[PDB]
């Protein structure tokens, strides 16, 4: 089995470089990107990464 499931982490999704708004001034929650897992359209914090192999071999006698 090779699981061909990939989900774009927080650093593989398009854009997302700049700090949306300064930390202190406004009254909104602190954020350092518009692509955190928190945000809509962001990346999965813990998702299927890359094609995954599940190979293993039992003793031939078994």
């Amino acid at each position: 089995r090779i699981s061909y499931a990939k989900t774009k982490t927080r650093a593989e999704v398009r854009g997302g470089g700049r700090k949306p708004w300064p930390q202190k001034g406004t009254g909104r929650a602190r954020h350092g990107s518009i692509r955190s897992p928190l945000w809509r359209g962001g990346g999965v914090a813990h998702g299927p990464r890359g094609p995954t192999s599940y190979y293993y071999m039992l003793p031939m006698k078994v």
């Binding site: 593989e12 890359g50 995954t52 192999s53 599940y54 190979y55 071999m57 031939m60």
Partner: protein
């Protein structure tokens, strides 16, 4: 409300098509074939994962070694960043030292 109202269409699975009727055939090609071949040599899939397993860091390292020089520029840069991050994480973060 987050629950559908009508019933979904029925997903009909044919338990006796060719792919299922012949699953596993030749998974003992070694023991029953004078060891000419090995089971791993039937794993169809990526060049860098046929018959090998590991965590994400090892998988990415292996991908870089075997097809790193064939990858598109942006994919390869993403891969290098991913290796850098995973190195930092697996080697410095965690409950257990």
């Amino acid at each position: 409300i987050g629950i559908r109202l009508t019933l979904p269409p029925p997903k009909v699975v044919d338990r006796w098509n060719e792919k299922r009727a012949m699953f596993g055939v030749y998974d003992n090609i070694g023991i029953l074939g004078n060891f000419e071949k090995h089971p791993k040599e039937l794993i169809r899939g990526p060049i860098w994962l046929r018959g090998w397993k590991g965590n994400e860091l090892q998988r990415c390292i292996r991908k870089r070694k075997m097809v790193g020089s064939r990858m598109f520029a942006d994919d390869l840069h993403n891969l290098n960043k991913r290796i850098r991050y995973l190195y930092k994480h697996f080697n410095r973060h965690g409950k257990f030292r």
